[PDB]
Design a binder for this molecule. Structure first.
Ligand code: FES
Length: 97
């Protein structure tokens, strides 16, 4: 399983969880007691946006983020399967706007 560090100083989040390659990051976090934002849970909005600081994901079901947003590291945590150990900033929807 992948090691996923989730951070947000404003929200008081600083936790590293395990996530299998076949579970989405949001779901693994919520299963482990972490309170992350989401609404559609289907990759079609920005509510669950996070930002990769390090690592990689497979978020190929996502349908919202453009190529420049992806290039900067943004991810939709509700449809992102980890493909490496990651460090992710949570609650990053503002950084898109
Ligand atoms: S909650 Fe809408 S894309 Fe993740």
């Amino acid at each position: 399983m992948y090691k996923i560090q989730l951070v947000n100083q404003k929200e008081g989040i600083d936790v590293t969880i395990q996530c299998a390659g076949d579970q989405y990051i949001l779901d693994a976090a919520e299963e482990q007691g972490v309170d992350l934002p989401y609404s559609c849970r289907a990759g079609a909005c920005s509510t669950c946006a996070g930002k990769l600081v390090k690592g990689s994901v497979d978020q190929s079901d996502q349908s919202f983020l453009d190529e420049d947003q992806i290039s900067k590291g943004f991810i939709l945590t509700c449809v992102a399967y980890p493909t490496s150990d990651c460090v992710i900033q949570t609650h990053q929807e503002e950084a898109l706007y």
